[PDB]
Amino acid sequence: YRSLFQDLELKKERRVILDCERDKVNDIVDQVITIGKHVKGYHYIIANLGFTDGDLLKIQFGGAEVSGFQIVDYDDSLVSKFIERWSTLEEKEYPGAHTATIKYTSALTYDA
Amino acid sequence: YRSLFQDLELKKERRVILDCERDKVNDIVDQVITIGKHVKGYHYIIANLGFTDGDL
């Protein structure tokens, strides 16, 4: 990645569209924080439905502008009453349930 | 720290001398990485004998 972003800085791209899984999103996000090129001037677009599924806090204050797509609108009460039931589940019996967030893949599984 | 470094960026200090324990060094280092102001132009001086003891 240090080879990769310097090759991006051979042309000095301030406009990056990532398209990865939320693991490989957060891998490359940590690589951006490694090189530190998340200051203002850069722009980042994440191309999955899990915009909320990433590490938003770690580059919330980094400087660059991050815009993405989220299908799981947490503002809806129909979504919220699910989260009122989802977050109160047992985390040991249901792994990944007790968190107030949820993957969109888990949301589409429940919708299926 | 986000309040603190912005107060440093009220005067825009590119020259910072830290003086902390290696825990509190690595705490503030992670705060510099949080605000991202560890790009070229800034300078940092660590004022303990444990230069190698930090997160280099």
From Swiss-Prot, chain B:
It is found in: Cell membrane; Postsynaptic cell membrane; Postsynaptic density membrane. Palmitoylated. Depalmitoylated upon L-glutamate stimulation. Ubiquitinated by RNF167, leading to its degradation. The M4 transmembrane segment mediates tetramerization and is required for cell surface expression. The gene is Gria2. Ionotropic glutamate receptor that functions as a ligand-gated cation channel, gated by L-glutamate and glutamatergic agonists such as alpha-amino-3-hydroxy-5-methyl-4-isoxazolepropionic acid (AMPA), quisqualic acid, and kainic acid. L-glutamate acts as an excitatory neurotransmitter at many synapses in the central nervous system and plays an important role in fast excitatory synaptic transmission. Homotetramer or heterotetramer of pore-forming glutamate receptor subunits. Tetramers may be formed by the dimerization of dimers. May interact with MPP4. Forms a ternary complex with GRIP1 and CSPG4. Interacts with ATAD1 in an ATP-dependent manner. ATAD1-catalyzed ATP hydrolysis disrupts binding to ATAD1 and to GRIP1 and leads to AMPAR complex disassembly. Interacts with GRIP2. Interacts with GRIP1. Interacts with NSF via its C-terminus. Interacts with CACNG2, PICK1 and GRIP2. Interacts with GRIA1 and SYNDIG1. Part of a complex containing GRIA2, NSF and NAPA and/or NAPB. Induction: Down-regulated in the pyramidal cell layer of CA1 in the hippocampus by global ischemia. Belongs to the glutamate-gated ion channel (TC 1.A.10.1) family. GRIA2 subfamily. Detected in forebrain. Detected in dendrites of neuronal cells. Expressed in the pyramidal cell layers of CA1 and CA3 and in the granule cell layer of the dentate gyrus. This is Glutamate receptor 2. The postsynaptic actions of L-glutamate are mediated by a variety of receptors that are named according to their selective agonists. This receptor binds AMPA (quisqualate) > L-glutamate > kainate.
